Nucleic acid binder design. Structure first.
Ligand SMILES: [Zn+2]
Ligand SMILES: [Zn+2]
Length: 44
DNA sequence: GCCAACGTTGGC
DNA sequence: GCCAACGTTGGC
């Protein structure tokens, strides 16, 4: 697993949105879509 | 042991 | 080609 960059706009966000697939569907095991690190959205 | 969330992949 | 679902790690 890679680590989030910590400094992109999504990484800086503190709150989960509550409304995306991640936030409403905890079965996904994903971070809030608005918080997903821009670096991690690119495949290795 | 809990909890958050990354990597993979099957289903579309 | 995308992404929801699952298995898994890794910080604590
Ligand atoms: Zn969200
Ligand atoms: Zn980031």
């Amino acid at each position: 697993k890679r680590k989030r960059c910590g400094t992109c706009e999504p990484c800086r966000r503190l709150e989960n949105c509550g409304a995306c697939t991640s936030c409403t569907n905890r079965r996904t095991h994903q971070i809030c879509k608005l918080r997903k690190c821009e670096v991690l959205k690119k495949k290795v």
